[PDB]
Design an enzyme around this catalytic site. Structure first.
Site, short mmCIF file in Angstrom:
data_model
loop_
_atom_site.label_atom_id
_atom_site.label_comp_id
_atom_site.label_asym_id
_atom_site.label_seq_id
_atom_site.Cartn_x
_atom_site.Cartn_y
_atom_site.Cartn_z
N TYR A 150 0.58 -1.15 -0.14
CA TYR A 150 -0.19 0.25 -0.05
C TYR A 150 1.23 1.12 -0.01
O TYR A 150 1.31 1.74 0.85
CB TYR A 150 -1.04 0.49 1.42
CG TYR A 150 -1.54 1.23 1.20
CD1 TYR A 150 -2.39 1.34 0.06
CD2 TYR A 150 -1.49 1.91 2.51
CE1 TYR A 150 -2.92 2.84 0.56
CE2 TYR A 150 -2.71 3.18 2.77
CZ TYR A 150 -2.99 3.90 1.40
OH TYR A 150 -3.26 5.08 1.96
N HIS A 288 -12.27 1.36 -2.53
CA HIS A 288 -12.10 0.35 -4.00
C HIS A 288 -12.35 -0.66 -4.44
O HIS A 288 -12.96 -1.03 -3.49
CB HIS A 288 -10.70 0.01 -4.07
CG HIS A 288 -9.47 1.51 -3.95
ND1 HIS A 288 -8.36 0.85 -4.05
CD2 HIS A 288 -9.34 2.66 -2.61
CE1 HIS A 288 -7.30 2.20 -4.23
NE2 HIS A 288 -8.54 3.51 -2.78
O1 LIG Z 1 -7.26 11.33 -4.36
C1 LIG Z 1 -7.48 9.48 -4.21
C2 LIG Z 1 -7.05 9.43 -5.38
C3 LIG Z 1 -5.77 9.81 -5.36
O2 LIG Z 1 -5.42 8.74 -4.26
C4 LIG Z 1 -6.60 9.23 -3.42
C5 LIG Z 1 -6.31 7.66 -2.60
O3 LIG Z 1 -5.91 7.10 -1.89
P1 LIG Z 1 -5.47 5.88 -1.85
O4 LIG Z 1 -7.03 4.95 -0.89
O5 LIG Z 1 -5.74 5.27 -3.31
O6 LIG Z 1 -4.31 5.80 -0.95
#
Ligand SMILES: *O[C@H]1CCO[C@@H]1COP(=O)(O)O
Length: 297
Positions: A150, A288
Site C-alpha cells: 500500500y 476501491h
Molecule cells: O485522491 C485519491 C485518488 C488518488 O489518491 C487518493 C486515494 O488514496 P488511496 O486510497 O488510493 O491511498
DNA sequence: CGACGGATC
DNA sequence: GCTGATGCGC
DNA sequence: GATCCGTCGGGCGCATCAGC
C-alpha cells in the site's frame, strides 16, 4: 446504472477507447489441467468496517472467484486486532500474514491471506523488517515472489511527494529487483499512481493531485515499468478504460468517475504466463474495488 | 476529488 | 464503561 | 480554448476524548 462501469466515463477520451466490461472482456476460464494461481487484491478501506458491511462474507468472495491468495490494503488494523480477525478469516485459507502501522494507529496495513503455504514470508523492504506503516508484505512461493504493498499517498498538498519519489519508490524498486535476481516477482496492491490519462477520469484537473503528478507518473515508468515490469491490465486491454477507485464525495461509482490505482505488475519473464488481469467493479464495501490475476504456473 | 468560476496562459 | 463529536489522512 | 488558482462541500474508517 445497475452496471455503471460498462459506460465509458472520461473528460478527454479517444474514439478507440471502450469502457471495461468484465462480463464480456474476460477470457474464458482456463483448462481443467492447468497449474494456475489465482490472486485477488483489494484495498478494503478498513477490514473491520468491511466485515461489518451489508452482507459481506469473505467466504462468498472466495466461492464466487475461487481465489488462491487474497491481498488486502488499508486494513486499518492494529497489531492488537490481528488475532481476532485471523481466526474469522476465510475458512479454508489458514495461512495468513499481516502487517500493521505501529505509528499512526488504525491506518494503512497490509495482509496476505493464502491457502498455499508460502515458502517464506518477510515484511518490509529487505531484512529491515516491517515497514513502520505496515505497508509491505512479501511472500515466496515455489516459482515466484508476491509483494503486496500500500504505497504511501503523497497527500493533499503533496507534502509527502518528496518522500514518495526519492525514498519509497526507489526502495520498492530495489526490493523488487533484488528479489527478481532469484525468482520472478509479482507486485500488487494500491500503487497510488494512475500511470496514464486512460487510468483517470479528469486527467487535466488532477495534474497536481496526488496520484497523477508527472513526478509520480514518471517514477512509475522509471522505477518500475522501465526496469523490467509489465502492467498486466494494460497489456491485455489496451485502450480500455477501467477504473479501480471511485471517490465517496460525489458517488463517483454511480457515475464511473474513477481512477485506476491498483495493479498487478509482473516481470517480463512471466508476462506470457498471464491469463487474465481483471477488475470486479461489482463488489462494493470500499472506495476501491477488487482486481484479480490468473497466472499460469 | 469533483466541481465551480475568474484570472491567466 | 458507553456515545456522539472531533480530527485526520485517505 | 486550455490551464491555473482558490475555493467549497450531504464522504469515509478509525483513534481519541468529553461528557455523561
Ligand atoms: O485522491 C485519491 C485518488 C488518488 O489518491 C487518493 C486515494 O488514496 P488511496 O486510497 O488510493 O491511498
Amino acid at each position: 446504472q445497475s452496471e455503471p462501469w460498462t459506460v465509458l466515463a472520461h473528460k478527454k477520451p479517444q474514439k478507440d477507447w471502450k469502457a471495461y466490461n468484465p462480463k464480456t472482456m474476460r477470457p474464458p476460464p482456463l483448462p481443467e489441467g492447468t497449474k494456475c494461481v489465482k490472486v485477488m487484491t483489494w484495498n478494503v478501506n478498513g477490514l473491520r468496517g468491511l466485515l461489518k458491511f451489508e452482507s459481506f462474507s469473505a467466504l462468498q468472495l472466495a466461492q464466487r472467484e475461487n481465489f488462491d491468495i487474497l491481498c488486502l490494503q488499508e486494513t486499518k488494523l492494529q497489531v492488537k486486532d490481528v488475532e481476532e480477525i485471523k481466526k474469522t478469516l476465510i475458512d479454508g485459507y489458514d495461512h495468513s500474514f499481516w502487517s500493521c502501522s505501529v505509528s499512526k494507529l488504525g491506518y494503512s496495513g497490509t495482509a496476505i491471506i493464502s491457502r498455499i503455504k508460502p515458502l517464506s514470508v518477510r515484511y518490509g523492504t529487505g531484512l529491515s523488517g516491517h515497514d513502520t506503516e505496515g505497508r509491505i508484505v512479501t511472500a515466496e512461493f515455489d516459482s515466484f515472489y508476491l509483494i503486496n504493498t500500500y504505497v504511501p499517498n503523497s497527500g493533499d498538498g503533496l507534502k509527502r511527494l518528496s518522500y514518495r519519489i526519492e525514498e519509497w519508490d526507489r526502495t520498492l524498486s530495489n526490493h523488487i529487483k533484488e528479489l527478481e535476481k532469484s525468482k520472478p516477482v509479482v507486485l500488487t496492491g494500491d500503487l497510488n499512481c494512475a500511470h496514464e490519462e486512460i487510468d483517470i477520469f479528469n486527467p487535466a484537473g488532477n495534474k497536481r493531485s496526488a496520484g497523477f503528478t508527472i513526478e509520480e507518473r514518471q517514477s512509475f515508468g522509471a522505477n518500475l515499468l522501465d526496469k523490467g515490469f509489465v502492467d498486466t491490465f494494460r497489456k491485455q486491454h489496451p485502450g480500455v478504460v477501467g477504473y479501480t477507485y471511485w471517490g465517496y464525495r460525489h458517488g463517483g461509482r454511480k457515475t464511473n468517475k474513477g481512477w485506476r490505482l491498483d495493479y498487478f505488475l509482473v516481470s517480463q519473464s512471466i508476462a506470457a504466463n498471464v491469463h487474465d488481469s481483471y477488475i470486479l467493479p461489482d463488489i462494493n464495501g470500499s472506495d476501491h474495488c477488487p482486481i484479480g490475476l490468473i497466472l499460469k504456473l
